[PDB]
Amino acid sequence: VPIQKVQDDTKTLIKTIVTRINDISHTQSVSAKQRVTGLDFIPGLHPILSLSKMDQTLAVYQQVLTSLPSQNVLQIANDLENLRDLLHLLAFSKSCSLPQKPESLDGVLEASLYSTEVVALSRLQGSLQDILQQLDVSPEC
Amino acid sequence: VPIQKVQDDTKTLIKTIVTRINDISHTQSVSAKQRVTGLDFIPGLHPILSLSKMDQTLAVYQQVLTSLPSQNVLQIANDLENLRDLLHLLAFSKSCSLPQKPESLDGVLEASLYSTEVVALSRLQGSLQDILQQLDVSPEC
Amino acid sequence: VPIQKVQDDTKTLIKTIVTRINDISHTQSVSAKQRVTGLDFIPGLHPILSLSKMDQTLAVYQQVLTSLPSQNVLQIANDLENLRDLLHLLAFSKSCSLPQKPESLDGVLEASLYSTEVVALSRLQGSLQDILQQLDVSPEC
Amino acid sequence: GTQDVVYFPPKILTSVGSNASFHCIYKNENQIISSKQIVWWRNLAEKIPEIQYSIVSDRVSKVTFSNLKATRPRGKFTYDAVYCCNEQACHHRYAELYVIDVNINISCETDGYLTKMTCRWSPSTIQSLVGSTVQLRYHRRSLYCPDSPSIHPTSEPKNCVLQRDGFYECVFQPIFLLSGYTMWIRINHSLGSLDSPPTCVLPDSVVKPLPPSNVKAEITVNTGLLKVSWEKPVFPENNLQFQIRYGLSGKEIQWKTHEVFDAKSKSASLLVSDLSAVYVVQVRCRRLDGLGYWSNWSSPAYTLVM
Amino acid sequence: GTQDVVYFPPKILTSVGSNASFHCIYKNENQIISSKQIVWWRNLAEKIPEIQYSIVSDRVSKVTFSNLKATRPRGKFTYDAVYCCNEQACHHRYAELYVIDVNINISCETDGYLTKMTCRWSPSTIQSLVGSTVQLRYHRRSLYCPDSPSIHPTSEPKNCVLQRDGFYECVFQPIFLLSGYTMWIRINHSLGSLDSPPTCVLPDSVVKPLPPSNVKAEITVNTGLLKVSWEKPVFPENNLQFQIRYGLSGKEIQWKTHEVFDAKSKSASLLVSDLSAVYVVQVRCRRLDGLGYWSNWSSPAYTLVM
Amino acid sequence: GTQDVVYFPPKILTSVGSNASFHCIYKNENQIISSKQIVWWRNLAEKIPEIQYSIVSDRVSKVTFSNLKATRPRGKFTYDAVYCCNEQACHHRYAELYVIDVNINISCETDGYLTKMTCRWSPSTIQSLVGSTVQLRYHRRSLYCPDSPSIHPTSEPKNCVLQRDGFYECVFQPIFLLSGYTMWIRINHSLGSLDSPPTCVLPDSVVKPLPPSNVKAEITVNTGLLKVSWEKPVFPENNLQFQIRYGLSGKEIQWKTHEVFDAKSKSASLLVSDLSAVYVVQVRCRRLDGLGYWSNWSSPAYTLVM
Ligand SMILES: *[C@@H]1O[C@H](CO)[C@@H](O)[C@H](O)[C@H]1NC(C)=O
Ligand SMILES: *[C@@H]1O[C@H](CO)[C@@H](O)[C@H](O)[C@H]1NC(C)=O
Ligand SMILES: *[C@@H]1O[C@H](CO)[C@@H](O)[C@H](O)[C@H]1NC(C)=O
């Protein structure tokens, strides 16, 4: 398995997910830095430096997007499944392993669906742009 | 409410009903003067001079046509409902009120449907032409 | 009833059945003389000379073809019904009457459908060509 | 008063061309009037001519209709109302006269493979009459058709399918080529039943063969002839006649026809005026005895020039 | 911390052009903040101008929207999320503002036989909003239409059929020609109901007559005139005006029109320049009082030349 | 007499190109004949060449078929009847040999939005074989395709829809862009099952992009150049190559093509011979690495002249 191709395909997939989020109209108008209270369980302020931090971050977004009822989020959730596997394949190359969070998400989906979806996709885009920008620099396990 | 328009619309509606009866082929060939026995409960020989006589005459034709099973008679029955209301509106103008007949009709419909329908529509046409011709002369209540 | 027309129509019908069997592809490649064991209850070696022998021969083929599940055989079975009636009509002309066989056929249809159908149609064709060739010579009852 | 009329019979169901008679009793206020006082009317529109009346007795009048025309429906009314009247004064009770054109023609055609027979008929004269059923009935005779077909008491219904053209198509499959199929249309009305004139068809005699195949057209310049050749269709086995149509190939073909009555002929030689023109040729066939239809024209065959 | 927001009311359902106000309480960690600290946001995308804010009290802030435009849906979200925020920091809870363009126009047309009235309307402004029902409602007044139509509390639903063009068609049959039919579209949403502005139609006043029949066009060479004649349609019984269009018959007709305001006119004489040309003529009609539609143009009539 | 035959095995289900062998015992009237007396036949039509026979033992004969061709069906019979015969005399019992062309090609295409993958396959070689089921099966590998695809024991059925062209279309939605989808057609026959050669597809590698958008064509008279410009489609994110076709606008365009291999190029300048003519231009794109399809040609762009 060519690692050079895996690193290039990981970057291409991240760009693909970012483009999908740009097409979801109600997310581009929202500032990913401007904070919303009650949705602190969604990765945002964290710098995300390590392979295990990247993996745990994407798993949280994966769990969040599964609950949302849109087909746009279902496709992004499938891309995140490929992205997590690519990160595990990159962790394998450099001989390191990665492991497998309150459930107040159920309440915020029931009361504030618009805020949950918009903030999740807006935070995901910011997280992916951070992962992409740090993939050029050799990441720690 | 303009009474001049109500009198003109009453005459126009009567002409409309007469035209509908002309289109019903099996009624035009039948002489409205030539008497048929057993159907004396259908207005025909009466001169129809007053507003209350006109109203009671149209109510009898209304009750007769409701029992008949054709869609041509159903439309004529709706026009008669408008005509009775116009007569009540004309009776109101001239400060007068109007009130609300054997049921051997059930038997003549069962035994002689062709005679009931043909004679009812033929007698109705004659009655309407009499009402129209007497509307030019001021009618009594 | 013109007997000359009945004799000509019998010959035309036989030619028609033979042509139908030629169109059934899997029968033309099979030699009607080359014997198959276990299907001896199908007329083949017999010379077929008399009207009663012709009738009993066609009745056997009729019973065999009824059991077969094809629509090609169903049409041929109907032609055989006309052919048997024509033979009875020809027997009537010349003042003679005709009458009305193991059932191992059920077993050979269950085990060997291809052999039953192919051999029955191939033997029928040979039998019909024999009947046709002997119809020019006056046949005995 | 107690006025009433009685018709004998109350209703009549008959077909075009037939004669029909109604008898009547006019009981005026508990006493039957003289038949001389009775006049007859049609749909309260017109008095039937006195010429058609008959004094059956001192109390019974009769009206006779001759060579009846199909009753034209007036909306929901599919029957003509016949009235027994006491001079100028008619009664509400009438006799129902139903006259239906039962002259339906059924045409049958057996396919080129002799596997099925399709029969076609138009219900143009029955479509108006609803509240009654209309079906094709048939009986099969083991061999041939009788000289004069008859409505056999024992018959079977045939399932017919209404087509986009308004005709019914009934398909018999498989067929009995030499059996006589007697068929007719039965109208089952509330008053009784009417049957159209029966027709007997031998499926073998109504075959429309497939067109002749392998049609070739070539110009032999050594003789200056247009040689047309063909192969007769697989069915029928009976002798056939052929018809060849030929013309100069162009925008609108000006056809010329040649007839072939030799059953074993597979070619025709025609002397043409122009040897350097492209000719178009088509061939069609029919039973020599005329017991069948003409096949469709074969696919066009063309000659060459270069 | 225990941060929470309360909207008064939690959701607003209104129509285009209306005004809407939301009140809010921001409980920051068990204590209500000052209304001066509260800022408002739209879909977390843009701060609503402070000009629209109103200090109801020391703890209650208010936002007012004036002349509301129809809310543009963002995917599954048919409402606009209005936010009560504690300065830069907003909360996850929002108020749902639904603004629907309820200005649907209903147009009715009575057939040339005065037997039915067909009403048509487009749901182009309602198609996006699903999870709520959309139906035509109506009430009938015995005679005539009121000067200003009103949504009567007692009404009945009308069955409408979606057509291939995207419009709904509702057919009233039989009709009451001189009864006023007040109709409107009702949107039954989960939050409540909205009604479009009602319209009252008198079926007698929206008739599209059949075209004039027996249209003839002839050139009288003795006078050099093109004589056009017609027969007015069976309905309506009211006085009609006619319009005649005529031109030289050709590939693309260059039309000329003539208007007839005499209700009892059955002909028009036109002086034409060319007596040997074929002219094509069509006639259409409308109520002289203008209370109705123009009929379709009659089937073309042509003059002759030989 | 008590004659009987036994085949080992009674029936064989195999695919084109394979080899197949039948063994037989001929029990003539309660005693097994010598294998030297046994001859083999195909559908009672032709003796199989003795070259294919093998004397397994004194009583067992064997027939070997090499590089089997798909069995041509004879009506209802989808198998070839192989016969064990005692010299000229054959028996009614036969062995059923079924050879099916299982070489079905499956082609997949991912949409321009990377939301679904549609796979297409023709059942032209399986349509004849009824009484058995035919379905597309698949297995998904988390990332990428293996070098040589294999029929994984664990697979799932995919619902395919027959199209008007006779091909089946199977749609995967949502998709896993970088997962290897191994798919094949499984024929579940009464005798067993056959699987077509598996193919592995990476949805990311079979994308047919949307055409380039905002295509403009302008003639700069200062340089005498035809300037073509475009915008690459939204997807894919990978480097693309472009192809421009251009020609003089007319009845039947005589095309000329220009290839662009610079992934970040949004324009091309072409030196044309006629500056006063209208040119028509279209642009299409494909992944520079060739892992995908060409997009459709963009909507035509035209230059001006006045
Ligand atoms: C019907 O009446 C005509 C005229 O009297 C007569 O010629 C004909 O025979 C009658 N039909 C029958 C069946 O009697
Ligand atoms: C809506 O607000 C505008 C502006 O203040 C005002 O003119 C209008 O009257 C208001 N509408 C109602 C129904 O009060
Ligand atoms: C099939 O037979 C041919 C000829 O003997 C041979 O070359 C081939 O290897 C055989 N196939 C197998 C799978 O053994």
**D191 lies in the same domain as D140:** yes
Provide the 8-state DSSP code for D203: G
Residue environment code for D226-247, b if the CB has 16+ CB neighbours within 10 A, otherwise e? bbbbbebbbbbbbebbbbbbbb
Domain of D83: which CATH number?
A: 2.60.40.10
With a 6 Å cutoff on the Cβ, whether E66 touches ligand 2 is: yes
Asked if D40 and D121 sit in the same domain, the reply is: no
Q: How many residues does chain A have?
A: 141
Going from the Cα of E138 to the center of ligand 2, the distance in angstroms, rounded, reads 30
Q: Choose, out of F37, F76, F130, the residue to mutate when testing the contact with C (most C CBs < 10 Å).
A: F76
DSSP one-letter string for chain E: ---EEEEESSEEEEETT--EEEEEEEEETTEEPPGGGEEEEETTTEEPPGGGEEE-SSS-EEEEE-SPPPPPPBTTB-SEEEEEEETTBEES--EEEEEE------EEEE-TTSS-EEEEE--TTTTT--SSEEEEEEEEESSB--SS----SS-EEE--EE-TTS-EEEEE-S--TTBEEEEEEEEEETTEEEEPPPEEE-GGGGB-PPPPEEEEEEEETTTTEEEEEEE--S---S-EEEEEEEEE-SSS---EEEEE--TT--EEEEE-S-TTS-EEEEEEEEETTS-SPPPPPPPPEE----
Instruction: Measure the CA–CA gap between D244 and D260, rounded to whole angstroms.
Output: 8
Report the number of distinct structural domains present in chain F. Answer: 3
Q: Does D238 touch chain C (CB under 8 A)?
A: yes
Residue by residue, DSSP assigns E114-171 as: SS-EEEEE--TTTTT--SSEEEEEEEEESSB--SS----SS-EEE--EE-TTS-EEEE
Cα separation, D235 vs D204, whole angstroms: 11
| SS3 label, residue F273 | coil
Closest CA to D110 of D269, D215, D250, D233: D233
**E289 burial class (0-12, 13-18, 19+ CB within 10 angstroms)?**
exposed
> Nearest chain D Cα to C81, which residue?
D176
Type of residue at F178 = L
Record: contact A86-F238, CB cut-off 8 A:
no
Nearest CA in chain B to E173: B75
CA distance A42 to A109: 13
DSSP for residue D69: P
Q: Burial, F290: exposed, middle or buried (Cβ in 10 Å; 0-12, 13-18, 19+)?
A: exposed
CA dist C105 to C24, C114, F20, Å?
Answer: 22, 13, 31
- Containing structural domain, residue F118: 107-206
Does residue E118 share a domain with residue E188? yes
Testing ligand 2's pocket by substitution, the residue of E14, E15, E16, E19 carrying the most ligand atoms inside 8 A of its CB is: E19
Chain C residue numbers with beta carbons less than 8 Å from the beta carbon of D236 are 12, 16
Nearest residue in B to E115, CA atom: B75
What type of residue sits at position C116?
T
Instruction: Count how many Cα atoms sit within 13 Å of the Cα of residue D105 in the half-sphere of its side chain.
Output: 1
What are the φ/ψ torsions at residue C115 (nearest 5 degrees)?
A: -70, -40
E304 touches chain A (CB under 8 A): no
Strand partners, F245: F257, F282
Q: Can you tell me the distance from the alpha carbon of F146 to that of F1, in angstroms, rounded to the nearest whole number?
A: 61
Give me the residue from E46, E89, E94 closest to A115, CB to CB. E94
Give residue F142's identity as a one-letter amino acid code.
Answer: S
The answer to whether residues D86 and D38 touch, using CB atoms and an 8 Å cutoff, is yes
Rounded Cα gap, residues C125 and F7, in angstroms: 30
Spatial contact of D275 and D245, defined as CB atoms under 8 Å apart: no
Domains present along chain A, CATH in parentheses: 3-136 (1.20.1250.10)
- Give the strand order in the sheet containing E117-121: E107-110, E117-121, E168-172, E161-162
The backbone torsions φ and ψ at residue D96, rounded to the nearest 5 degrees and listed phi first, read -95, 115
E223 ligand 2 Cβ < 6 A: no
> Are residue D27 and residue D63 in the same domain, yes or no?
yes
**Nearest CA-CA partner of E153 in E198, E190, E122:** E198
Provide the shortest C-alpha distance from residue C43 to chain F (in Å). Answer: 15
From atom 10 of ligand 2, which residue's Cα is the shortest distance away?
Answer: E19
Q: What is the dihedral of CA F204, F205, F206, F208, to 10 degrees?
A: 80
Kindly tell me the burial class for residue A19, based on how many C-beta atoms sit within 10 Å of its own C-beta (0-12, 13-18, 19 or more): middle
Q: Which of D283, D296, D233, D279 is nearest to D257 (CA)?
A: D283
Note whether D92 contacts B26, CB cutoff 8 Å: no
Does residue C10 contact residue C83 with C-beta atoms inside 8 Å? Answer: yes
Are the beta carbons of F68 and F20 closer than 8 angstroms?
Answer: yes
The tokens for D101 are 């054109």
Distance CA C29, CA C119 (A): 11
Q: Which residues contact residue F92 at a Cβ distance below 8 angstroms, ignoring those fewer than 6 apart?
A: C36, C37, C38, C39, C108, C111, C112, C115, C116, C119
CA–CA gap between residue B139 and residue B52 (Å, rounded)? 10
Going by their DSSP bridges, the two strands E90-91 and E95-100 should be labelled as: unpaired
The DSSP 8-state label assigned to residue F74 in this structure reads B
Last residue of a domain, one of F206, F223, F239: F206
Q: How far apart are CA D282 and CA D242, in angstroms?
A: 10
E21 and E47 share one domain: yes
Of D70, D100, D130, the position where a domain reaches its end is D100
Distance CA F128, CA A54 (A): 55
- Phi, psi at residue D180, to the nearest 5°? -85, 120
Same domain, E23 and E72: yes
The Cα-based distances of D120 to D101, D108, D140, D180, D203 in angstroms read: 17, 6, 18, 17, 14
Which ligand 1 atom sits nearest the alpha carbon of residue D66?
Answer: 2
User: What residues line ligand 1, using a CB cutoff of 6 Å?
Assistant: D 19, 66
User: In Å, how far are C40, C78, E155, F267, F285 from F210, measured between CA atoms?
Assistant: 71, 62, 52, 18, 8
* Cβ-Cβ contacts under 8 Å, E91 against chain A: 36-38
Q: Comparing C-alpha atoms, which of E289, E118, E262, E286 is closest to residue E209?
A: E286
Ligand 3 atom closest to residue F66's alpha carbon, by position in its atom list? 2
- Pick from E32, E3, E192: which is nearest to E96 by CA? E192
Say how far apart CA E54 and CA E56 lie, in whole Å: 6
> What kind and span of H or E run contains D243?
strand D240-248
Helix (H, G, I), strand (E, B) or coil at F284: strand
Query: Hey, are the CB atoms on F89 and C112 less than 8 Å from each other?
Result: no
With an 8 Å Cβ cutoff, are E74 and A108 in contact? no
Experimental method: X-ray
* Separation between Cα atoms, residue E148 and residue D45, nearest integer Å: 51
Q: How many CB pairs below 8 Å do chains A and E form together? A: 61
CB F33 within 8 Å of CB F121 = no
The residue out of D69, D100, D131 marking a domain boundary is D100
- Exposure of A9 by Cβ count < 10 A (0-12 exposed, 13-18 middle, 19+ buried)? buried
- Count of all residues that appear for chain C in the document: 141
Within an 8 Å CB–CB cutoff, is residue F291 touching chain A? no
Region for E167 from its dihedrals, namely left if φ exceeds 0, alpha if ψ lies in -120 to 50, beta otherwise: beta
Residues from chain B that touch E140, judged by Cβ atoms under 8 A, are none
Residues of chain C that touch chain D, judged by Cβ-Cβ distance less than 8 Å:
1, 9, 12-13, 15-16, 19-20, 23, 71, 74-75, 78-79, 81-82, 85-86, 89
**CA nearest to C17, candidates C86, C107, C110:** C86
Contact flag F89-C37 (C-beta cutoff 8 Å): yes
Q: Count residue pairs from A and F with Cβ separation < 8 A.
A: 43
Same-domain check for residues F21 and F94? yes
Contact E88 A37 (CB under 8 A): no
The candidate with the shortest Cα–Cα distance to F129, out of F82, F184, F190, is F190
Closest ligand 2 atom to residue E66 Cα is 2
Contact E176 B1 (CB under 8 A): no
Distance CA C94, CA C96 (A): 6
Residue nearest to atom 5 of ligand 1 (CA): D66
| Contacts (Cβ under 8 Å, ≥6 apart) of A39 | A108, A115, A116, A119, A120, E92
Contact criterion met (CB below 8 Å) for E207 and E285: no
**D48 shares a domain with D23:** yes
CA dist list (Å): F109 to F123, F144, F150, F175, F201: 19, 17, 21, 12, 10
> Residue C94: which region, alpha, beta or left (left: phi > 0; alpha: psi -120 to 50)?
left
Nearest to E153 by CA among E171, E169, E166, E137: E137
Which residue lies with its CA nearest to atom 14 of ligand 3? F19
In contact, F108 and F117? CB cutoff 8 Å: yes
